[PDB]
Design a binder for this molecule. Structure first.
Ligand SMILES: [Fe+3]
Ligand SMILES: [Mg+2]
Lengths: 211, 196
C-alpha cells in the first residue's frame, strides 16, 4: 500500500528528537500506553482474532492526515480497536459509549490482499536480484524506495514465515517463504542525493526476481 | 480543510478498548499487567550489552553471535516476542551499521528494550535511510568519509542488533566494566561506546 506510512526517503523533516545517550524517560510515558501492545497480543494469542501483520496493515489504513497527527501508541489503540470491530468482537457504538465520545477508526481496506506467489526462486548469498516492479494496494513489506531496484543477497533466512500480503489480510493462502537481506548501494536507491553507503532491506522471496 | 477528526481523550479511548474486551471475559486476569511488567522490566538493552561484552571477550561466542545470532541469544535465555530470529551485524574500522524500521517501529525488543520515541519518529523513519551520515552527526556521532555506513531497514522478521567495535583503552576490562559502556543507542547503531 503506497500510504503515507512509507516514509523512507521523504524529504522535509527536521532533526531527529534525540542526541546520543540522552534520557528517553520511562518505557511508558502515560498510564494507558501499555494497552495497545498488550491488547494486540490478547487478540493474536488469546483470541486468535488476527495476526500481527493485520495490525501493521490496519495502522497503514488510518486516514492519511489522521496517521500523520497521531502519536505512535495511539495509532495502535486505533488499529487494535478497528480490528476488534471488523472481526465482529466489538462494536464502534460500545467503544464510543465507553469512551464518552468519538472514536474514529482506520478506513476499510480497499484490497482483499494477494496469495503467496506460486512462482519464486531460492536465491543464494552473492546473487544479484531485482525487486519485482509490482504495485500492491493492500499490505506489503516492501518500502517503495527499493521497488524495481537491484541489489545483492547477503543472507537467506533459515526460517520461513507467512507472506505478509496474504496474512496481513487474514487470508488462508499465505504459505511460507524465507526472507533475504538484500544489500543496495545508496546510489541505486537515491542517486546522488544521499550521504550513505549501503542499505539492507529484508525482503520476502515473493518480492524478488533474478537480476 | 485537513482538520483533525473529533476524538475523545486518548486515555478514555484506550481504557474503553480495555473495558469493552475485559467485560466480555476476553482478557485473562492480570494479562495486560503481565505485559506491562515484561515490557518495563524484562525487555532491556542491558541484555544486548551483556551479549556485546561477552562477544568482545570470547572469540568463539563472537563467531556464534555473528553467524547464528538466534542460537547465541538463546544461550542467555533472551529470545522473546519481536526477537525470535536475531541477526547481529558487526561494525569494523571501515563499516558502521545502523538499524531502523522505516515502515513502523520494528525492533529486537527483548535485547534492545522497546524502541524509544525518537526511533519511531517520522524524522528518523524518513531520514536515516537516505542521509544516515547527517542524521548520526546531528545526533552527536561523527562518522568519517571513508567509513561505509550501512542502514538495515527492519522490514520483515529478522530482528537486529549492532555489535560495535570495542574501544581502545578498555584492554583487560571485565565483562561488567565493558557492559557498562554499551548503551541502547550503541545497540541500535546511532552511538559508539564511550570510554571515560
Ligand atoms: Fe516496525
Ligand atoms: Mg510512497
Amino acid at each position: 500500500m503506497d500510504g503515507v506510512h512509507d516514509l523512507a526517503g521523504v524529504q522535509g523533516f527536521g532533526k531527529v528528537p534525540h542526541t546520543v545517550n540522552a534520557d528517553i524517560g520511562p518505557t511508558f510515558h502515560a498510564e494507558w500506553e501499555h494497552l495497545p501492545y498488550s491488547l494486540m497480543f490478547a487478540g493474536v494469542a488469546e483470541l486468535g482474532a488476527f495476526s500481527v501483520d493485520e495490525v501493521r496493515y490496519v495502522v497503514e489504513r488510518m486516514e492519511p492526515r489522521h496517521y500523520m497527527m497521531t502519536p505512535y501508541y495511539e495509532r495502535y489503540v486505533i488499529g487494535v480497536a478497528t480490528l476488534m470491530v471488523e472481526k465482529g468482537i466489538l462494536t464502534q457504538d460500545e467503544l464510543e459509549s465507553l469512551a464518552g465520545g468519538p472514536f474514529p477508526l482506520s478506513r476499510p481496506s480497499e484490497s482483499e490482499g494477494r496469495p503467496a506467489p506460486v512462482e519464486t526462486t531460492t536465491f543464494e548469498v552473492g546473487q544479484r536480484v531485482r525487486v519485482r516492479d509490482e504495485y500492491v494496494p493492500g499490505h506489503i513489506r516492501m518500502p517503495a524506495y527499493c521497488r524495481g531496484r537491484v541489489g545483492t543477497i547477503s543472507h537467506r533466512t533459515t526460517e520461513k514465515w507467512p507472506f505478509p500480503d496474504a496474512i496481513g489480510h487474514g487470508r488462508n493462502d499465505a504459505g511460507e517463504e524465507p526472507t533475504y537481506h538484500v544489500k543496495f548501494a545508496a546510489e541505486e536507491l537515491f542517486g546522488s542525493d544521499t550521504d550513505g553507503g549501503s542499505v539492507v532491506v529484508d525482503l520476502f522471496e515473493g518480492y524478488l526476481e533474478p537480476a | 480543510e485537513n482538520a483533525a477528526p473529533a476524538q475523545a481523550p486518548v486515555s478514555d479511548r484506550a481504557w474503553a478498548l480495555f473495558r469493552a474486551l475485559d467485560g466480555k471475559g476476553l482478557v485473562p486476569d492480570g494479562y495486560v499487567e503481565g505485559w506491562k511488567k515484561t515490557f518495563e522490566e524484562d525487555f532491556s538493552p542491558r541484555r544486548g550489552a551483556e551479549l556485546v561484552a561477552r562477544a568482545w571477550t570470547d572469540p568463539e561466542f563472537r563467531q556464534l553471535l555473528l553467524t547464528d545470532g538466534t542460537a547465541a541469544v538463546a544461550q542467555y535465555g533472551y529470545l522473546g516476542p519481536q526477537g525470535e530470529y536475531i541477526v547481529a551485524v558487526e561494525d569494523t574500522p571501515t563499516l558502521k551499521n545502523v538499524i531502523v524500521c522505516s515502515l513502523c517501529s520494528c525492533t529486537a525488543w527483548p535485547i534492545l528494550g522497546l524502541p524509544p520515541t525518537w526511533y519511531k519518529s517520522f524524522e528518523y523513519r524518513a531520514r536515516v535511510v537516505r542521509e544516515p551520515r547527517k542524521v548520526l552527526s546531528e545526533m552527536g556521532t561523527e562518522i568519517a568519509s571513508d567509513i561505509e555506513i550501512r542502514v538495515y531497514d527492519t522490514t520483515a522478521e529478522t530482528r537486529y542488533m549492532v555489535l560495535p567495535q570495542r574501544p581502545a583503552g578498555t584492554e583487560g576490562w571485565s565483562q561488567e566494566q565493558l557492559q557498562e559502556i554499551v548503551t541502547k543507542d550503541c545497540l541500535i547503531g546511532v552511538a559508539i561506546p564511550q570510554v571515560p
